[PDB]
Amino acid sequence: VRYRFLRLAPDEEGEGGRAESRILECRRLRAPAEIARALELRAGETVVTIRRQLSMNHMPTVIDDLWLPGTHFRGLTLELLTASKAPLYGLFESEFGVSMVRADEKLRAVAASPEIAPLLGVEPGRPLLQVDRISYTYGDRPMEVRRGLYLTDHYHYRNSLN
Amino acid sequence: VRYRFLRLAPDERAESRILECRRLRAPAEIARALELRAGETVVTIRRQLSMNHMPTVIDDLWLPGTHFRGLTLELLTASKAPLYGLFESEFGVSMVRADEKLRAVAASPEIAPLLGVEPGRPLLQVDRISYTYGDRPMEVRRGLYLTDHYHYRNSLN
Amino acid sequence: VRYRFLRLAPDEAESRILECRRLRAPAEIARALELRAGETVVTIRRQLSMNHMPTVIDDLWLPGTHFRGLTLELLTASKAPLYGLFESEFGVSMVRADEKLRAVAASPEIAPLLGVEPGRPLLQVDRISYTYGDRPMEVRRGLYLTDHYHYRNSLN
Amino acid sequence: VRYRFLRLAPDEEGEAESRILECRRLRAPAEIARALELRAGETVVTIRRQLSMNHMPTVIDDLWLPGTHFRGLTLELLTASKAPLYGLFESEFGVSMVRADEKLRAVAASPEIAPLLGVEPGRPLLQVDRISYTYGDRPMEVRRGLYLTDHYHYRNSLN
Ligand SMILES: [Cl-]
Ligand SMILES: [Cl-]
Ligand SMILES: [Cl-]
Ligand SMILES: [Cl-]
Ligand SMILES: [Cl-]
């Protein structure tokens, strides 16, 4: 299936035109300390980071920043990402054998930063939905940190609660 | 326990105050969400939640009159009870599920002062429909959250 | 990704299609799918195996109007997980599911299909899946053998 | 409100009484120590209790709590309490659960459990093994529940 965790849904009637992904950045770096703690890494551990844009109905809707433990994702390259017709979580499953069983999220409303605003086609200060996620594999092992910034003007985040 | 659906968590306990309580003919949208007849009477409440002495949420709720008859400002403001608990104990309506739609919005001129912010300030808007037994809708609740000290926590399977 | 709703997890999955048939909706099925009475539905029975042993028996009911062309030939011609097929071939994506879980005794009918004795405790998962607009699109009844696997759930 | 995590819902149309069976302090079993992220040999409080609905036994729950945080938890406190257990943990002990992770399976009623649910040994029960978490992902409870799902089911919504 198309999505693992994405809760974007259109405001208007119909099936959510499916998200198109475009990789913006891809680098390896030393984990910032907050990242290393979220991923239960040793200080100084290398992480792969990706920035991507999701677009829906030909309009940018999400800017995602992801951080992955360098250890498990050594094979991850820009060439792989950009050639890949897969959604990221599907890629992590098929190429890297990493399947997420749970995600813990923290949602807030924030102002569009000077850096983010033009990537979403908006003015700085525009309210955006920030979704900070840590995703877990089996045994409560953290394997991804993702911070999403969502422009919720034509789309909402759908949540059912028990 | 203290909370039924509230997902506010500190980045590093809620106190409620009733702003408004009123009975009226259900607006179209409400009648639809609550699956009421046209113009059926509903009770509407506006309320403010604060945490750590600071305003955090404004909620507008709409409830079907026929299940919430005794529901008065007097019952409310004399109530030292959370609203879902009041609905359970006093009215015998327990919620089994809620469906929510979350968005980020600019603080409206109406809401902004109620949260101590400038109009335009980013707020989390949580539109909820709560269901009781039989997939029966019992409440429409629109919440505007100031997320400067608090976030909305969610776990996904 | 591989799964939409499946919560089976190893204490530490291959699908075989048994049937795919059109019939008039049984009453409980038309009610759940909100169909006119006796509306045509497609029903599927399938078996999931994990580690080369049968683990789940699923029965599924889908509205015929949205699943025209959903045949045994298609299901066998195709590689796809059923939810992925419903999205890619039929354009039906599930946004929500409501489930009811019970422990039940393996019925004389189901016990042989899981390789167990009638009476054996099974996890019964009764699901209704919804698409956009809170339209029910699927009724799925699963019976799960939970001797090596459990159903994982996180609660808020 | 009445329930924190309980997902029991009746099969029959429409809209739960607790009785303490056992209570004591013990050295954590190794698996319990691991679930609660305790040091080896830490003391836990353990409670068994019965839930009934419609004046019939429906649930047997076994609970393990960190002895450190739950020093004042006594039998006399429990049986005098008019509160739901999660309500007591909140109000008396300041422990509030933000999340529960569960593992559900169908099991045979054991000779020990069966009499307490009014069933015969071998009857199918739903086992719900739970770890509950407070803020910061700190585990504060292990609960194993055994549910008779003959007139009740476990309701779950999935996104
Ligand atoms: Cl590009
Ligand atoms: Cl008040
Ligand atoms: Cl979920
Ligand atoms: Cl939940
Ligand atoms: Cl007694």
mmCIF file of C-alpha atoms in Angstrom, chain C residues 50-141:
data_model
loop_
_atom_site.group_PDB
_atom_site.id
_atom_site.type_symbol
_atom_site.label_atom_id
_atom_site.label_comp_id
_atom_site.label_asym_id
_atom_site.label_seq_id
_atom_site.Cartn_x
_atom_site.Cartn_y
_atom_site.Cartn_z
ATOM 1 C CA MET C 50 3.916 -17.240 8.105
ATOM 2 C CA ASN C 51 6.967 -19.402 8.084
ATOM 3 C CA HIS C 52 5.312 -21.983 5.934
ATOM 4 C CA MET C 53 2.428 -22.672 8.292
ATOM 5 C CA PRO C 54 -1.188 -21.432 7.847
ATOM 6 C CA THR C 55 -1.846 -18.628 10.393
ATOM 7 C CA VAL C 56 -4.865 -16.608 9.270
ATOM 8 C CA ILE C 57 -8.093 -17.455 7.438
ATOM 9 C CA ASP C 58 -9.718 -14.309 6.088
ATOM 10 C CA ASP C 59 -13.149 -13.912 4.572
ATOM 11 C CA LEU C 60 -13.762 -10.606 2.810
ATOM 12 C CA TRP C 61 -16.825 -8.970 1.320
ATOM 13 C CA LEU C 62 -16.586 -5.966 -1.065
ATOM 14 C CA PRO C 63 -19.220 -4.016 -2.999
ATOM 15 C CA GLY C 64 -19.459 -5.209 -6.580
ATOM 16 C CA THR C 65 -19.947 -1.768 -8.064
ATOM 17 C CA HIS C 66 -16.411 -0.656 -7.077
ATOM 18 C CA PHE C 67 -14.709 -4.046 -7.627
ATOM 19 C CA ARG C 68 -15.853 -4.979 -11.123
ATOM 20 C CA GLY C 69 -13.189 -7.140 -12.656
ATOM 21 C CA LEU C 70 -12.087 -8.427 -9.297
ATOM 22 C CA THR C 71 -11.776 -12.077 -10.262
ATOM 23 C CA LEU C 72 -9.930 -15.197 -9.304
ATOM 24 C CA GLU C 73 -7.906 -14.717 -12.561
ATOM 25 C CA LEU C 74 -6.841 -11.216 -11.513
ATOM 26 C CA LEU C 75 -5.891 -12.308 -8.025
ATOM 27 C CA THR C 76 -3.718 -15.100 -9.293
ATOM 28 C CA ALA C 77 -2.257 -13.114 -12.164
ATOM 29 C CA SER C 78 -1.265 -10.420 -9.648
ATOM 30 C CA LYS C 79 1.634 -10.221 -7.162
ATOM 31 C CA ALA C 80 -0.183 -7.825 -4.935
ATOM 32 C CA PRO C 81 -1.233 -7.675 -1.308
ATOM 33 C CA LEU C 82 -4.971 -7.213 -1.373
ATOM 34 C CA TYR C 83 -5.055 -3.643 0.028
ATOM 35 C CA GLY C 84 -2.339 -2.610 -2.494
ATOM 36 C CA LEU C 85 -4.386 -4.208 -5.311
ATOM 37 C CA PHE C 86 -7.545 -2.416 -4.146
ATOM 38 C CA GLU C 87 -5.598 0.904 -4.358
ATOM 39 C CA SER C 88 -3.732 0.337 -7.575
ATOM 40 C CA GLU C 89 -6.214 -1.553 -9.653
ATOM 41 C CA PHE C 90 -9.516 -0.200 -8.280
ATOM 42 C CA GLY C 91 -8.452 3.170 -6.805
ATOM 43 C CA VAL C 92 -9.840 2.350 -3.363
ATOM 44 C CA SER C 93 -7.697 3.461 -0.507
ATOM 45 C CA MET C 94 -8.627 2.708 3.137
ATOM 46 C CA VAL C 95 -8.397 5.564 5.589
ATOM 47 C CA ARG C 96 -9.924 3.880 8.665
ATOM 48 C CA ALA C 97 -10.810 0.468 10.056
ATOM 49 C CA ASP C 98 -13.124 -0.455 12.963
ATOM 50 C CA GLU C 99 -12.474 -3.834 14.550
ATOM 51 C CA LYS C 100 -13.944 -6.122 17.107
ATOM 52 C CA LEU C 101 -11.684 -8.727 18.663
ATOM 53 C CA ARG C 102 -12.648 -11.916 20.378
ATOM 54 C CA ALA C 103 -11.180 -15.232 21.509
ATOM 55 C CA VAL C 104 -13.217 -18.024 20.025
ATOM 56 C CA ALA C 105 -13.079 -21.811 19.727
ATOM 57 C CA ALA C 106 -11.911 -23.052 16.316
ATOM 58 C CA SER C 107 -15.040 -24.132 14.516
ATOM 59 C CA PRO C 108 -15.277 -27.493 12.756
ATOM 60 C CA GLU C 109 -15.007 -25.491 9.448
ATOM 61 C CA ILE C 110 -11.952 -23.368 10.290
ATOM 62 C CA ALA C 111 -9.929 -25.764 12.452
ATOM 63 C CA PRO C 112 -8.783 -27.915 9.514
ATOM 64 C CA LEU C 113 -7.810 -24.867 7.494
ATOM 65 C CA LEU C 114 -5.372 -23.797 10.286
ATOM 66 C CA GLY C 115 -4.191 -27.325 10.969
ATOM 67 C CA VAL C 116 -5.668 -27.481 14.442
ATOM 68 C CA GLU C 117 -8.200 -29.310 16.483
ATOM 69 C CA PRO C 118 -11.759 -28.004 16.743
ATOM 70 C CA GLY C 119 -11.954 -26.078 19.972
ATOM 71 C CA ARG C 120 -8.453 -24.583 19.790
ATOM 72 C CA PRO C 121 -8.397 -20.890 20.921
ATOM 73 C CA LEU C 122 -8.271 -18.465 17.955
ATOM 74 C CA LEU C 123 -8.252 -14.713 17.717
ATOM 75 C CA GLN C 124 -11.232 -13.510 15.771
ATOM 76 C CA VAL C 125 -10.834 -10.054 14.153
ATOM 77 C CA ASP C 126 -13.988 -8.556 12.623
ATOM 78 C CA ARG C 127 -13.143 -5.476 10.612
ATOM 79 C CA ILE C 128 -14.967 -2.849 8.665
ATOM 80 C CA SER C 129 -12.715 -0.737 6.445
ATOM 81 C CA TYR C 130 -13.602 2.686 5.313
ATOM 82 C CA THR C 131 -12.495 4.829 2.452
ATOM 83 C CA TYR C 132 -12.838 8.548 1.933
ATOM 84 C CA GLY C 133 -16.107 9.983 3.157
ATOM 85 C CA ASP C 134 -16.666 7.338 5.805
ATOM 86 C CA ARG C 135 -17.849 4.989 3.130
ATOM 87 C CA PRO C 136 -17.473 1.373 4.166
ATOM 88 C CA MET C 137 -15.764 -0.602 1.498
ATOM 89 C CA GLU C 138 -14.844 -3.915 3.134
ATOM 90 C CA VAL C 139 -15.970 -6.345 5.684
ATOM 91 C CA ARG C 140 -13.229 -8.720 6.643
ATOM 92 C CA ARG C 141 -13.454 -11.544 9.168
#
